[PDB]
Amino acid sequence: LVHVASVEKGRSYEDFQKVYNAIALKLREDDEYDNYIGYGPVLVRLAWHISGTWDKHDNTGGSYGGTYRFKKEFNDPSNAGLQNGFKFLEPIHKEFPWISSGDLFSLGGVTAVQEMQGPKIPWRCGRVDTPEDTTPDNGRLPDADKDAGYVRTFFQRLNMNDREVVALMGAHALGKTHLKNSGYEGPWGAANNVFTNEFYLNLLNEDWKLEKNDANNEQWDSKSGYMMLPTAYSLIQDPKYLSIVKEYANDQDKFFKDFSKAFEKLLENGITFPKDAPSPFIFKTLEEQGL
Numbered sequence: 001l002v003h004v005a006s007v008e009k010g011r012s013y014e015d016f017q018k019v020y021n022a023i024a025l026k027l028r029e030d031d032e033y034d035n036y037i038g039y040g041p042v043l044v045r046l047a048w049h050i051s052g053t054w055d056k057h058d059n060t061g062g063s064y065g066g067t068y069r070f071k072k073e074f075n076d077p078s079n080a081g082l083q084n085g086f087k088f089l090e091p092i093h094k095e096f097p098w099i100s101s102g103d104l105f106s107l108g109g110v111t112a113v114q115e116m117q118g119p120k121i122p123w124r125c126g127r128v129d130t131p132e133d134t135t136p137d138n139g140r141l142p143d144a145d146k147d148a149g150y151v152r153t154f155f156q157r158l159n160m161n162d163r164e165v166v167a168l169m170g171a172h173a174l175g176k177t178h179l180k181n182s183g184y185e186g187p188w189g190a191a192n193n194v195f196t197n198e199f200y201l202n203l204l205n206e207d208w209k210l211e212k213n214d215a216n217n218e219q220w221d222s223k224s225g226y227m228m229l230p231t232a233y234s235l236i237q238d239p240k241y242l243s244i245v246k247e248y249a250n251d252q253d254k255f256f257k258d259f260s261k262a263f264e265k266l267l268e269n270g271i272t273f274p275k276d277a278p279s280p281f282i283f284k285t286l287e288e289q290g291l
């Protein structure tokens, strides 16, 4: 497969900034979702799962084709709970019927991170909706009960190196786990809809205890009422991962710059951009626009 980015016919920067604004105004408005966490965290989880299916070996999966719209991918067990972010974005797609699905699903994750005070993420338009038979089979997304060796190997398929894996994993300061979606339950920390380096500080400073939960899965629980997935607690057991965790725990600006680069790479894997194509867009937040 080659997947060439094609801009939506006739659309420029300001068209896309209007779609960003619609998502951002609806995030402000629907603030009650999930006990007042809001839709921000489930929207960056949606942008990572439609991107996370990519296989570097045959160029299949990834964000390009917007295939989460099809039943197979939509009903993937690993995607349970993401229907909420889909339903959030659906009125915005009736409003801007010209945007492709992969562009809208990835822009929703960019808008959520920046509206939750995260770094600016450069974004490129040009994904093209591909057919129902290009939809990847279930099972390409990662397990939660594994170790640092599994993590390294998994992310090699999306060719992410150690630093990019540790930067991307910082998104787990956002939102929470839900027992009915994944067999895990509890918040990651205290500031769950503000983008910060809290994941790393918690990993290095809490007194974590291993326990079984009500679904019979193990998780790490701390005295503060926070939890950690086994795959994510793995990052302090590997010496390479642990030196990068400590770097981000001490320097939130370094974490923001690295997360920005890594998240854009994740949302663009598998897509070829011609050089006639527009440069990456940097969207203004609602606040910067006075809206």
Ligand code: HEM
Binding pocket: 041, 042, 044, 045, 048, 080, 081, 142, 143, 144, 151, 168, 169, 171, 172, 174, 175, 176, 177, 178, 179, 180, 181, 182, 183, 184, 229, 231
């Ligand atoms: C090996 C890597 C990862 C595993 C095993 C994993 C697993 C999980 C699990 C089991 C949940 C909770 C699902 C639920 O019950 O609703 C979760 C939530 C979440 N994940 Fe990950 N994750 C991984 C990587 C990532 C990455 C790379 C991102 C984004 C860059 C990300 C962003 C999120 C966010 C924001 C949530 C919270 C969603 C909400 O509040 O509903 N995760 N993850």
